[model samples]
Target: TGREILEKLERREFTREVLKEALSINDRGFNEALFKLADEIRRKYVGDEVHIRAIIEFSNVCRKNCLYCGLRRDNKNLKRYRMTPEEIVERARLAVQFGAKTIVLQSGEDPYYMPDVISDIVKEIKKMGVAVTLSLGEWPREYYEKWKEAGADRYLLRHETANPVLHRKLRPDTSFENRLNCLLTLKELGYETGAGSMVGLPGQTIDDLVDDLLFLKEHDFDMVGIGPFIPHPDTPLANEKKGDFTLTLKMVALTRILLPDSNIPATTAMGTIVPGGREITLRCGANVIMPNWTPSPYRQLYQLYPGKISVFEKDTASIPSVMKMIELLGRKPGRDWGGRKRVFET
Candidate 1:
């Protein structure tokens, strides 16, 4: 019966009941079948090229006071820092040299780096002949459009949770509608947009996850990042338990099954939670890995959660180890600007 259900899903048959059934399946055979099917679907659609995007966490200064983030403005514990625009461009250059086809510029919602400043950085990075992705928090349409005009090819703004109530609870200063609007706006502005959610939040359920999946499906995002929620020690949810690793993996697999061609990254947070977590995720449905390229002291300071692997490792070993992992897994590192396999005309 589980096999039959898996077959139906492979045929592109989608229903909330089917998703719920798949999510609730606990039998080991069923779990294996599900992952196998998902992996098969992944191979059929995205191929075996594991795209490695270099993430530069340029700034730890955030304006939001979200309860779950260590970088929350109210947290006196986080020592904020912002890398100069030139410094950011230098990092991007190094990441390109280290074989990153895409440079993801990530930071908190700090307003110090004005729109024009980021545009200049994007312009310089574009000269290196690589795709650029931005993960800066919400901004007005003009800012997004300006960056897009400056050759920023992709944008990542995780919805965090699809449930309106839980979203509001987790990020009181942000509105659920505005968050959705921001994602839609990115799409409208011709950026290869991404939206995703955490597997376990303080108040989240299977149905909420179902909603998250449906949201991804309905939006038809070019990229999807699904990872477990690890509590931040300096935040309000410090005592909350981390999300289940298996459940998080299941979500990644299901995402591949639902949106067969979307680029799903084996998030760093996943790696932090379990040893070889990223490798385990890739076997399921993920095809992307974002290695931290934010240099030294800054990398150690951008602590969204405790025990991040990047903070402990030396800079030289990061990319090579990523390559070794791919070698062992029988997958090749992506050579080109690994945009989504299928691009829909906006």
Candidate 2:
């Protein structure tokens, strides 16, 4: 059966039904072969350059109460911090000086921020010749339009899960419909919209993951991120089992095969679970890494999940270390702004 699946995949028959079954490939030998095939697919389209997204975690304060997230509002253990606009811009400058090709401004769903304040920072980051991506949570159409007008290049909003029930269970305060609508709006507003989902979430079926892979293929997202569902000690799901690391890799590989030209990141979340996780992902069809450059004082506090590698490795291996790792792996850092490799107009 594994052999038959590979044959069908090679013939480009990874249709919805075909993908649904292949996703259950529990055989060791076949999974290894899938990895090889996936890497080949990645190179066939996007080639060997890896994009670096320097994430400046500007704030830790959030307003919603997500069941699985560490940043959820009720987590009283957190000492919230918000970087001043001046501090963020200066950090962006230092990141560029240290070889960042893109700047990702990520924050919790905090309401303390004013619209113009962030828009101004976007304008300044754009002037530095690096692409800017924002991952601030759900906002209105006007909010998205204002940032895009201010020169933001991309927006990342993880669907978290395509299973509507799980999406609701995990994010009680947010609706699954709203997440889908927001992604569509981001695309409509001319931002290179990025969407992603977590692997091995509790109650998540393999069918749900199949849908996630197909979701991007159908939506034609410019960028996609898939990583394991790491649990946090302070969250409701703290007692739940961790996500399977190998399964997360399979999701990454499958995503590459499904969407040949989207920018896929080897998430820092992976690095938290396994050694040399980022490099392993690169070889398995991942083409990007978002390193955190947030100031040390606040990096550890902005914990979406516990034991995040970014907070611990801040001083140990900066962006320069990553470049050397890239070269060692026989690939180069992405030269341009790392725009969408291919976009199918919807």
Candidate 3:
């Protein structure tokens, strides 16, 4: 019955209140409703193929003072490290050998690592014949162009939140306008652009989330990644409460219904709280899984928020385990590129 309601909702015939209420359902009701919704959406849009991306924490040195990040400029508790171009290339090679179709280079807003350095690393990763995605924080249009030229296939810059006031509170120095400009620039440059927000973030309201949904609808992003906001112990919000998992799942299912063709992943944060978080995400309309490829020693150094999950210990460092996990979840790990395809694209 809930599935039938979600099916109609997927067609844009349901009220926003209904979706919001579904997010607050009890565990059994919540899972049943979500799975029914997810199954219908998946069959319609994604089928049974699951895409996996290997993520490399290329660097941890950051310049911004985001209040929630453990790797913030003010955080002295984190052991900072930067990967050499050679080391990055080696890691990319390892990721490819293990069957990764795409390699995501993620890091904080570290300016010391210049555009040229990143450009060189992108070039090296391309040489290994794997698609490259960058999740490094905002940068100039020229820098985005430079990386695109050097062989970046996509760029993931989560807008964090579409509400300017909330975004300002979370990142005091960064403006929503600047973040939007970066995202627009990426799209204009022809890159497969991704935009996402956190569920249950401090001061986040239902209206704020509505803005996020509307923002995605307006932009029509190639990928949509929504995860729960988990606080960092070293940050100001350390003792603050974490995000609601049901809300996170509801968002994932709704996102799938909203953008049927977009690449959506069950982020590590989801798996951090629940052992089968990734699988649940897949079942709930998420088609992508990005397992950490960051080396064990340096993994703890790149904490955006504290208590982040590092699944590499489960031997997810390689492609086989990733594939195995996909199989275990009853979904096929996709080998072919699934998202929008373009070259020299942002």
- Number of the top lDDT candidate: 1
lDDT score for candidate 2 against the true structure: 0.88
RMSD of 3: 3.4
For each candidate, give its TM-score against the true structure: 0.97, 0.97, 0.92
lDDT of 1 by residue, 64-95 (tens): 98888888988898788999998899989998
lDDT of each: 0.90, 0.88, 0.80
lDDT per residue (tens digit) for residues 18-79 in model 3: 65555544568656766677667676666777787889997888889887677788888878
Q: How far in Å is the alpha carbon of 125 misplaced in model 2?
A: 1.1
Instruction: Evaluate residue 85 in candidate 2 and report its C-alpha lDDT on the 0 to 100 scale.
Output: 92
lDDT of 1 at 203: 81
Candidate 2 per-residue C-alpha lDDT over 1-346 given as tens digits, one digit per residue, 9 for 90 to 100: 9888888888878788778777887899988888888899888788899888888999998888988899999899889999999999999999998888899999998787757788999999889998999999998889899999999999999888888888999999988899999999999999999999999888998899988988888898888988888899998889888888999999998888878788999998898889888899999888888877888788878898888875566543568777887899999899988887773432
Worst 10 residues of 2 by lDDT: 309-318
TM-score between candidate 3 and the true structure: 0.92
* Superior candidate under lDDT, 1 versus 3: 1
Off by over 4 Å in 1: 343-346
